[PDB]
Amino acid sequence: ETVREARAEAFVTMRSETLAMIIDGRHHAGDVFATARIAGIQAAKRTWDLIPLCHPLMLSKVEVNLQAEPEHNRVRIETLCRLTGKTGVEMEALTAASVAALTIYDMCKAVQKDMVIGPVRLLA
Amino acid sequence: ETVREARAEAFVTMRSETLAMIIDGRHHAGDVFATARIAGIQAAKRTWDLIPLCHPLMLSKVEVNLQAEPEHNRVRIETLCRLTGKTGVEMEALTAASVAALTIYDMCKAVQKDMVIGPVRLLA
Amino acid sequence: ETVREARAEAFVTMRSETLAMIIDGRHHAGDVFATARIAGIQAAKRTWDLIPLCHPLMLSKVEVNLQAEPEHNRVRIETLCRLTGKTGVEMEALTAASVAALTIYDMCKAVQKDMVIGPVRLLA
Ligand SMILES: Nc1nc2c(c(=O)[nH]1)N[C@H]1N2[C@@H]2O[C@H](COP(=O)(O)OP(=O)(O)OP(=O)(O)O)[C@@]1(O)[C@H]2O
Ligand SMILES: Nc1nc2c(c(=O)[nH]1)N[C@H]1N2[C@@H]2O[C@H](COP(=O)(O)OP(=O)(O)OP(=O)(O)O)[C@@]1(O)[C@H]2O
Ligand SMILES: Nc1nc2c(c(=O)[nH]1)N[C@H]1N2[C@@H]2O[C@H](COP(=O)(O)OP(=O)(O)OP(=O)(O)O)[C@@]1(O)[C@H]2O
Numbered sequence A, B, C: 001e002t003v004r005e006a007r008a009e010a011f012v013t014m015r016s017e018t019l020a021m022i023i024d025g026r027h028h029a030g031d032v033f034a035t036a037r038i039a040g041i042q043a044a045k046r047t048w049d050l051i052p053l054c055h056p057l058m059l060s061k062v063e064v065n066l067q068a069e070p071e072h073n074r075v076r077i078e079t080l081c082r083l084t085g086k087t088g089v090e091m092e093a094l095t096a097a098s099v100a101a102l103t104i105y106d107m108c109k110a111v112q113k114d115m116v117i118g119p120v121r122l123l124a
Helices: A016-024 A032-045 A090-108 B016-024 B032-045 B090-108 C016-024 C032-045 C090-108
Strands: A002-013 A061-069 A074-085 A116-123 B002-013 B061-069 B074-085 B116-123 C002-013 C061-069 C074-085 C116-123
Touching: A002 A090, A016 A061, A016 A074, A016 A090, A032 A061, A032 A074, A032 A090, A061 A090, A074 A090, A090 A116, B002 B090, B016 B061, B016 B074, B016 B090, B032 B061, B032 B074, B032 B090, B061 B090, B074 B090, B090 B116, C002 C090, C016 C061, C016 C074, C016 C090, C032 C061, C032 C074, C032 C090, C061 C090, C074 C090, C090 C116
Parallel strands: none
Antiparallel strands: A002 A074, A002 A116, A061 A074, B002 B074, B002 B116, B061 B074, C002 C074, C002 C116, C061 C074
């Protein structure tokens, strides 16, 4: 039994107006980043129930951080998962990143029909 | 890693007729107290999934006890949660008490529109 | 804290045509056995949430195996559950077997109205 951790990233690519709306609605009720962070945290804790062969685990830590990248017309999501145990937490990190990305998508899709999620991958 | 425990209480205040109906339907199919106890136990085990920042834990014990207080026109709910681990179980105890209270409410609301839940708090 | 395990079996009895359809659709998209295995695995991990008094546990292993028994006009399901902990996994094994059986039933019920599930029991 050891300390295990994993980090993942995801991106959501969108038009400039769409990203500007996220930036302008930040820190207000309906905060896209706040909502996506909570969604990702909740999703990480449910990973065992979403991915058939994953084991139930006791996550002691899940972090989801989001940043606008206006220069690339996209949002970057980075996640961190940690626990002390025998099973790793790669899928928790990826699932948290993915559901955070889907939540950004959900909150922007009225404005834009052709957003793209990706890449979604582990960080070294 | 130690033995951790928490106790909570909740109250549901109602008219005398409403409480009398609970007392009279006790030990029969549709037992309000039996249903509320099971709801509270189930809710305690799901606390991590209801409260965003709570950690998943392995509850080894959850107890929910209910008593009519005819003298005060109310039901009192007391809960107990225990486990051996590194994280406490205050939220499990409060959530079990709260959902037990909501279940009493649900089973009585046809009869009464203005029941009040509270206080809900930890016990020392 | 020790290694704990449990094994269960379940049977679904059906007409010969119904069983033949399962055998003939095996290894194809809509594989009844593949679907039932995944359902049973997922169900085992949720046992604590289905059975009110069961404890949440960290299952390290769940196996679900299915075999056609043409000679008896039935499907046999055998399950295995294991973990290292203080609480046994009998209910996880039985629940995995039961939900696997219900999934076989679901996937065959258009064809047959009078299938029977049982026995469902622990193995020694
Ligand atoms: N929650 C959660 N669970 C996880 C992962 C995760 O990131 N998060 N990674 C691992 N894990 C689940 O188990 C896989 C690894 O298999 P395992 O080594 O536990 O199987 P064993 O019991 O050793 O036996 P074999 O099956 O190896 O023979 C796996 O790749 C998942 O399927
Ligand atoms: N199921 C469940 N979970 C619970 C509680 C509960 O009653 N029941 N209480 C605790 N806990 C969750 O974690 C909170 C306490 O934070 P923590 O001390 O674990 O965080 P750490 O990993 O130490 O890092 P920081 O974030 O402290 O820097 C908390 O207050 C909950 O948010
Ligand atoms: N997931 C899951 N959980 C399980 C089982 C299972 O197969 N799978 N078997 C056990 N268990 C739940 O706990 C029952 C056994 O009770 P227990 O010995 O834990 O209670 P204690 O805390 O010792 O106190 P008392 O209540 O004994 O006084 C039980 O029979 C279940 O109710």
